[PDB]
Design a protein around this ligand. Structure first.
Ligand SMILES: Cn1cc(Nc2ncc(C3CN(C(=O)Nc4ccc(-c5ccccc5)cc4)C3)nc2C(N)=O)cn1
Ligand SMILES: [Cl-]
Ligand SMILES: [Cl-]
Length: 283
């Protein structure tokens, strides 16, 4: 617990509020972070072997991310459960609107946000491509890019989030392998399905799936196809079908993310420019 990058926030400064989400590998909770001047701040808390010092170093590296389309880590708190075991807790800024996937579903209800215009849908994709272009430059592999892991800020801009399964290219990954094997198969590139080996081209494939999720307003990828058939399905050349009212140009941008050879897929900088140009060409 040396903490050379000063990422740890004193546990006494944090009071855990209500639970927002609960999964097999942890939970998201509301919280108040008592700032130095006595003012409490609204934050979200992510709760959960390998030496915890490595977790803090990765957290410290993400704390240095400065891009409006990438969530910013505030710090880490350590909790001692049952019989003296250090359990880290990621402190994130509180984001009212929640995840993009749920938001898209809510928009199809009379009570939710109004019908999302095509230009707003295309702007969500540009925001994700900008965040992914920034992470891609820093040699970061997200490895879990999906609309459910993109957060909506209060000003309605999207940011890429959920870096629990991330890895810097060339860095160690042994203690993440168990969690990687349980990842949803419908977002995984054809070459990564075989042994769960990822490249930046695996994130490009998942970005195309994320674009299709936004264009269909929250549909689960591949209707009619079960998870156990996914590898065979892609092996036969089949891909996500064109969503209704999706511009043929937009669908071509998504289809380029799913080319069999990872080297044939474009980069996030190319995708980002194509989406910004497509967005400019509309009323
Ligand atoms: C119903 N509702 C829910 C909400 N709000 C939320 N719900 C979900 C989330 C997701 C948790 N996220 C996230 O980034 N986790 C994450 C990031 C980094 C690391 C990590 C791991 C190792 C090393 C370094 C870093 C681990 C996990 C986003 N955030 C919020 C929010 N921020 O307000 C509002 N309404
Ligand atoms: Cl489909
Ligand atoms: Cl089609």
């Amino acid at each position: 617990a040396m903490d050379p990058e000063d990422v740890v926030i004193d546990r006494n400064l944090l009071i855990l509020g209500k639970i927002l989400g609960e999964g097999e590998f942890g939970s998201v909770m509301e919280g108040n972070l008592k700032q130095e001047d006595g003012t409490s701040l609204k934050v979200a808390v992510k709760t959960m072997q390998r030496e915890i010092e490595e977790f803090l170093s990765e957290a410290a590296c993400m704390k240095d991310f400065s891009h409006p389309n990438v969530i910013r880590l505030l710090g880490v708190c350590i909790e001692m459960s049952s019989q003296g075991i250090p359990k880290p807790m990621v402190i994130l800024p509180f984001m009212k609107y929640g995840d993009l996937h749920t938001y898209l579903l809510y928009s199809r209800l009379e009570t939710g946000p109004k019908h999302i215009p095509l230009q707003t849908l295309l702007k969500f994709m540009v925001d994700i491509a900008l965040g992914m272009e920034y992470l891609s430059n820093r040699n970061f592999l997200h490895r879990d890019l999906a609309a459910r892991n993109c957060m909506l800020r209060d000003d309605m801009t999207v940011c890429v989030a959920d870096f629990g399964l991330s890895k810097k290219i060339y860095s160690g990954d042994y203690y993440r392998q168990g969690r990687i094997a349980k990842m949803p198969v419908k977002w995984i590139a054809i070459e990564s399905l075989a042994d769960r080996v990822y490249t930046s081209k695996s994130d490009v494939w998942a970005f195309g799936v994320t674009m299709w999720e936004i264009a269909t307003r929250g549909m689960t990828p591949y209707p009619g196809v079960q998870n156990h058939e996914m590898y065979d399905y892609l092996l036969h050349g089949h891909r996500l079908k064109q969503p209704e009212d999706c511009l043929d140009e937009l669908y071509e941008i998504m289809y380029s993310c799913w080319r069999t050879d990872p080297l044939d897929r474009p980069t996030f900088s190319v995708l980002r420019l194509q989406l910004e140009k497509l967005l400019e060409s509309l009323p």
